[PDB]
Ligand binder design. Structure first.
Ligand SMILES: CO[C@H]1O[C@H](CO)[C@@H](O)[C@H](O[C@H]2O[C@H](CO)[C@@H](O)[C@H](O)[C@@H]2O)[C@@H]1O
Ligand SMILES: CO[C@H]1O[C@H](CO)[C@@H](O)[C@H](O[C@H]2O[C@H](CO)[C@@H](O)[C@H](O)[C@@H]2O)[C@@H]1O
Ligand SMILES: CO[C@H]1O[C@H](CO)[C@@H](O)[C@H](O[C@H]2O[C@H](CO)[C@@H](O)[C@H](O)[C@@H]2O)[C@@H]1O
Ligand SMILES: CO[C@H]1O[C@H](CO)[C@@H](O)[C@H](O[C@H]2O[C@H](CO)[C@@H](O)[C@H](O)[C@@H]2O)[C@@H]1O
Ligand code: CA
Ligand code: CA
Ligand code: CA
Ligand code: CA
Ligand code: MN
Ligand code: MN
Ligand code: MN
Ligand code: MN
Lengths: 237, 237, 237, 237
């Protein structure tokens, strides 16, 4: 199996797999069952923003989601990713729809990764920013139902010609280049991520959500990962 | 009295005032007595590097000091700085020598402050980088015995014409522009500071240390703050 | 007198003073009379964006102003600013109204400056970004009628409580910190400055314009510089 | 054939193919015969630095090569790359050795690409920085004799166990991700590239040079491109 570390924005509360009864954000290490969660009040048809942060020093992974206005949900989990993730990875965005559906749409995505060693300087860095996604995006690796170019946006899960979400959909987008996410000689290994999202659904129950993830370079959508598994895991275990 | 938040690299162990018996790094909130300290083995005559980090999300304040070849010391303190510092502040570097002395010398200093709000984007950023210092540095406010231009560096404590350190010395350097370190409307307020330094002492007991600090805009050296007070505090309380 | 270098967005064609017969963008070295200009059709009530760029390698000072919908204006001037400007300067925005008037309004402003020497690295840099302006902006120096806040914006010329622009009004906004614009040991010295604006005028003839400028550190508004002089130069020479 | 745009540091004067009689820096457009060249006094065994700069406003492609000791060489060419390079490209370094040899070695490399459209606040960007190279660098594609690690440098051309360069060698390193170097909707499309290098040669005549280039994504080393063709070109035309 792949190694996966993800921050999830969970619209659908699948409780039999361990999810809280409320839409929630959570931190996932190698399991669909978050190590930490926070109640999230999503505003249907609104553009939200998610900031994720980690530094090798404080060894605390953090995430915050917020809207204009407005309310915000914060979740933090103490971990040292040196001991979780492999040295090289790929980063990505993943979304699904189960029996219940919704529009999972990325307006913008940015990422920064810094390795600061004990030498001088010495800084290795990777930073990219998408404030929009063209029709043929070469620095993005698209998987499943994920497509770009529509209104300059990125649609993770299948959407019809009228702008209607689809059920049992899964899609993902990984950055083309592999990222060096830590090294043995780096005194500081840090990363920042940010994205904006529009989740719009029709029925009273949208599902299942959006997630930012880090996985081994060859990572791909596991089998039967639509709906509640959010595309990131083969099993709810 | 000023409101100070500082990261101290402490060369000389004043025990009577609460320090540990070994050279140590610490996190000081409004007191010379660190809330969190870590043991630090200083390599005399070598160029060290200090990475200070914070984000309003994890609300954890972190510090690391490293030398090439290995050997770093880490300290971290959970704090929400919205509740300590004023909205508008000035950042700088400070150093002292009491009865025991040492050369507190800065080869490089950089600073990055980001305010990201619940709107879109919208980011307010300030970032500066000093890879060397000139004779007249107009973007720096020098205080006390602090001088620049010598071998292209910044000297925080007084050094003789042969390169010898002096006792009972104190000095500081502040950035000219005030910094907006938080705003009530900012979902994320983050800051990152880095510096390289060379501490070189003759006698077996170097003193008293170096510190990176954030203070009120009008902040100035408190009377009689040399030696153990590191120039940052009027009193050892 | 002060040493000025400016990129001017000129709404009102003063042809006695040497301006072309149309609204124009221009490049002004130490004079209100542009060294170069290009025709600019401004869209009343629309938010535009100006991208200014200079590098000491190609020694070309370029400027472009664009609106949504993709029409723009471009001007470039071959110059070595080594021989024009003082080593240390201040950067800012300046606007005026004449008999005629308009709202000179700034939504966002960002500035990058990098001095890369023949050493290793060695990079000195300043970067600041304002995507909104607070009520009291301590890192800004307001001159004339320039004010901030109430909408989160900066108004360069006097505007009333109802939102109407005023005539014979002049105002400037400079960055607090003096910037090191160039050095003798610098192999490359380059700067980028961007800003967005909204120019709204009730009358058929908006005036007089908006300017991005670079000045000596003690530079202040000259006497009688409103209207056509754009709050930049003492005289029309 | 590939579409190559390059900035060459040419250590060997091949005058039958269009070179000047001195070692030089040059700007190549789809030809081994430069559009612009400059005289370059190279310091054997010294670490030099190259700064490549281009923006879509001034439309001037510039390059500067400087050494500690302050000496430098500068070349510029007026060109609009929209019409030359494909929308998506790949960026990299190339070096070769002919009958005459030399060590082509890279201590650091960095690259920055921005697309700023008329969309007001929408910027797409890619930035990467290598201050050193590990044994297996996954974000790099290595071609020919190019290798990494062991001192954390990048040798573009073959060097033996003792540190001696080899003849008839060719090597190239390309960043893994495809880079979006322009877009029809971008008002400003620019890029910066910087790298440090050490060229050492035993014999009195070092060859053949190092070059930074931008090509089609699938680009590979052309047959018989060693020596004078600098690994960039299939022929001397
Ligand atoms: C009524 O919905 C619950 O019961 C259904 C029948 O057993 C399940 O199909 C359903 O889960 C499926 O839909 C959800 C929501 O989209 C998805 O999260 C889950 O992975 C399944 O695809 C749910 O348990
Ligand atoms: C090493 O001497 C010890 O005792 C002296 C008193 O008898 C002290 O003055 C001395 O401290 C002074 O020097 C230290 C070290 O530089 C400095 O931290 C302290 O502020 C005083 O200036 C020390 O305790
Ligand atoms: C119709 O106004 C023009 O003619 C008037 C009479 O000669 C001028 O006073 C007037 O000058 C003022 O307005 C212009 C346009 O805003 C401005 O450029 C000038 O500096 C004065 O403010 C203008 O020429
Ligand atoms: C003495 O070398 C010159 O004349 C030789 C033929 O007698 C050439 O082969 C030689 O060119 C080869 O070496 C150069 C320098 O390494 C290289 O640029 C060229 O591509 C060939 O490999 C040169 O002209
Ligand atoms: Ca769920
Ligand atoms: Ca002490
Ligand atoms: Ca005018
Ligand atoms: Ca040649
Ligand atoms: Mn969940
Ligand atoms: Mn202490
Ligand atoms: Mn004009
Ligand atoms: Mn040549």
């Amino acid at each position: 199996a792949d190694t996966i570390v993800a921050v999830e924005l969970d619209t659908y509360p699948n409780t039999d797999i361990g999810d809280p009864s409320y839409p929630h954000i959570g931190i996932d290490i190698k399991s669909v069952r978050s190590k930490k969660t926070a109640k999230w009040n999503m505003q249907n048809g609104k553009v939200g923003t998610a900031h994720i942060i980690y530094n090798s020093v404080g060894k605390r992974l953090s995430a915050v989601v917020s809207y204009p206005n407005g309310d915000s949900a914060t979740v933090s989990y103490d971990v040292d990713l040196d001991n979780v993730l492999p040295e090289w990875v790929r980063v990505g965005l993943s979304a699904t729809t189960g029996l219940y559906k919704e529009t999972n749409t990325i307006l913008s995505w940015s990422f920064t990764s810094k390795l600061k060693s004990n030498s001088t300087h010495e800084t290795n860095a990777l930073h990219f920013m998408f404030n929009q996604f063209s029709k043929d995006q070469k620095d993005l690796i698209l998987q499943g139902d994920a497509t770009t170019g529509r209104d300059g946006n990125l649609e993770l899960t299948r959407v019809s010609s009228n702008g209607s979400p689809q059920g049992s959909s899964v899609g993902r987008a990984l950055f083309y280049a592999p990222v060096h996410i830590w090294e043995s000689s780096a005194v500081v290994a840090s990363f920042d991520a940010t994205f904006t999202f529009l989740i719009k659904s029709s029925d009273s129950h949208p599902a299942d959500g959006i997630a930012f993830f880090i996985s081994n370079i060859d990572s791909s959508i596991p089998s039967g990962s639509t709906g509640r598994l959010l595309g990131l895991f083969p099993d709810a275990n």
